[model samples]
Target: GSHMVEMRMKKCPKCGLYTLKEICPKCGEKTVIPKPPKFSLEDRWGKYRRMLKRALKNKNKAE
Candidate 1:
């Protein structure tokens, strides 16, 4: 098994650049590892929780 660490590569939010260094070369912005947050399988309110928050935000903006 090869211990490849390509997953440590980072993404820049400002310039949409993919880089292995912590700082983006183009925008000079600190890059973050591009991956979705890992959620626990046992989460009780995981489902549709984000939907409810967005619904509330939309309702507030409509007023």
Candidate 2:
């Protein structure tokens, strides 16, 4: 597994800019979780693959 997990972003309430941290690095204010961006086919497929891999691993362990 890659350690490069993508961080979910949010818009800073005070600065109104996109940020990954709970506290806005730019304005040093709290940020709010905004609505998710439009769904991407590639991201959905990637998550599907991860889920399948976990399922297969568990199945193998059980048997």
Candidate 3:
């Protein structure tokens, strides 16, 4: 399910280019928004998948 999650793009303070990481690999400059959130897209989806698995496993069992 490849879907867009609206990732915030960071701008290089030195080169002024859009980059995904804190440090721009292209120009080797620090980004304006250096830090990202605690959890990433993968982490969020992984937790969701785990919850779904647990729910399906207990679907046939009694409460």
Query: Native-vs-model 2 lDDT?
Result: 0.60
TM-score for every candidate vs. truth? 0.46, 0.38, 0.35
Per-model lDDT: 0.64, 0.60, 0.59
Highest lDDT model number: 1
lDDT of 3 by residue, 1-63 (tens): 599753466878777778755457877866665454577756756556445433122122233
With a 3 Å backbone cut-off (N, CA, C), the pairs that clash in candidate 3 are none
- Model 2, stretches more than 4 Å misplaced? 1-7, 36-63
Clashes of each: 0, 0, 0
Model 3 accuracy (lDDT, Cα): 0.59
Residue range 1-63, candidate 2, lDDT tens digits: 767744467788777888655568886886665664466766856556445433121121221
Candidate 2 TM-score to native: 0.38
Question: Residue by residue across 1-63, what tens digits does model 1's lDDT show?
Answer: 588633457799787788766669896887766774587777666675565333121121222
Give the better candidate number (1 or 3) by lDDT: 1
